């Protein structure tokens, strides 16, 4: 959907003679809090055998992008499952927010590796501060001084069935 | 330019249901042999 980023903090279930559990925190990209909590429980169990009943979510907050209208190069480390084993992937995404980059990554995974939301785990999203630290050329290409490109073959939308002139694809 | 016959992509009900049964049997045997 339209993704949001949630910080989710959970812990073990308190018991007698058991104070101060290990406060496990995670950052989950999900359309809503119900899905975020389910994903948190799933990842917690995968990390360590902590069932949903054996745990408790003590906090969940929505994290907004700090400078939402600044263009940022993001490196995204993920891992996803298939019929073959799990694979680790590094991707570079140029966008103005982490949620936008994560949505782009989910769509790219679906289009390329046929993977889905339940199969992708987002290990880390980080802004790459220096231009020189980028690796993928499909991102490094848009970083040159005085970048300019045309948009050849413009296709205009027609509201009516019939047009009374041949269309031009000029731009 | 003698164009030859082309295989039909119109699936028959008999073949479709037979394939369904084949898949079910394949999964059951996969479970049994994984147990063994």
């Amino acid at each position: 959907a339209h993704f949001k980023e949630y910080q989710v903090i959970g812990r073990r279930l308190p018991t007698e003679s058991v104070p101060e559990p290990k406060l496990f925190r995670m950052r989950i990209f999900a359309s809503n809090e119900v899905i975020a909590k389910s994903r948190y429980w799933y990842f917690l169990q995968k990390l360590h055998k902590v069932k949903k009943a054996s745990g408790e979510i003590v906090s969940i907050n929505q994290i907004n992008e700090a400078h939402p209208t600044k263009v940022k190069n993001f490196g995204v480390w993920v891992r996803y499952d298939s019929r073959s084993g799990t694979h680790n992937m590094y991707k570079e995404i140029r966008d103005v927010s982490r949620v936008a980059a994560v949505e782009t990554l989910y769509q790219d995974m679906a289009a390329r590796h046929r993977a889905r939301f339940r199969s992708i785990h987002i290990l880390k999203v980080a802004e790459i501060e220096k231009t020189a630290d980028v690796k993928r050329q499909y991102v490094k290409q848009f970083l040159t001084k005085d970048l300019k490109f045309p948009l050849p073959h413009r296709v205009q939308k027609s509201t009516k069935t019939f047009s009374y002139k041949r269309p031009s694809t000029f731009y | 330019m003698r164009v030859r016959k082309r295989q039909s992509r119109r699936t028959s009900t008999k073949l479709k249901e037979g394939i369904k049964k084949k898949a079910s049997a394949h999964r059951k045997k996969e479970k049994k042999m994984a147990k063994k």
């Binding site: 050329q137 499909y138 290409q141 848009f142 970048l147 490109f149 045309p150 050849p152 | -």
Partner: protein
């Protein structure tokens, strides 16, 4: 990788003029004019001066960028043909039956007529493409020279002449008769 832009250079020597409009290319040099219809390719032509012309592809894939260099090389060949021409020398060899090669005029057109190939009673006719002139080498045995502005025309004429004298149902180890492209060069060979 789906590059944003790819460019190739086309140099223009001091004697030739290139006119490009809607991907029709006319090259006019000291030796004449050539015209190429490149509307089956999707490229953009630009010039910064009278000595250099850029050919660019925007947001192209592998096949598009593959065609880009081809377009550049074709225009280069047009420039070379209009400034220095092309000269293909062929030699015909035989064991017993001397190959007889003549320029004849049949139905108002030029033909290379080949007689007595391996003793054949059949007359072979190879139409001379327009723009290429046929000559016979002086002080050289069994050499025919094809000269033209269009490398496509000259090379296809030489290929037609070579293929028309194929050896059929024999051993090519034993029977060496035929017409062969001896050499490919230009009409100017100063050094």
């Amino acid at each position: 990788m789906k590059y944003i832009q790819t460019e190739q250079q086309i140099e223009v020597p001091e004697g030739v003029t290139v006119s490009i409009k809607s991907r029709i290319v006319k090259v006019v040099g000291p030796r004449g004019t050539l015209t190429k219809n490149l509307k089956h390719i999707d490229v953009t032509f630009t010039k910064v001066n009278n000595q250099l012309i850029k050919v660019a592809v925007h947001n192209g894939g592998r096949k598009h960028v593959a065609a880009l260099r081809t377009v550049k090389s074709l225009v280069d060949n047009m420039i070379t043909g209009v400034t220095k021409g092309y000269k293909y020398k062929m030699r015909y060899v035989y064991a017993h039956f001397p190959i007889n090669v003549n320029i004849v005029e049949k139905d108002g057109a030029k033909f290379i007529e080949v007689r007595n190939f391996l003793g054949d009673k059949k007359i072979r006719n190879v139409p001379v493409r327009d723009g290429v002139t046929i000559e016979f080498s002086t002080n050289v045995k069994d050499e025919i020279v094809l000269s033209g502005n269009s490398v496509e025309d000259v090379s296809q004429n030489a290929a037609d002449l070579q293929q028309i004298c194929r050896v059929r149902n024999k051993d090519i180890r034993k029977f060496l008769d035929g017409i062969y492209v001896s050499h490919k060069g230009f009409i100017t060979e100063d050094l």
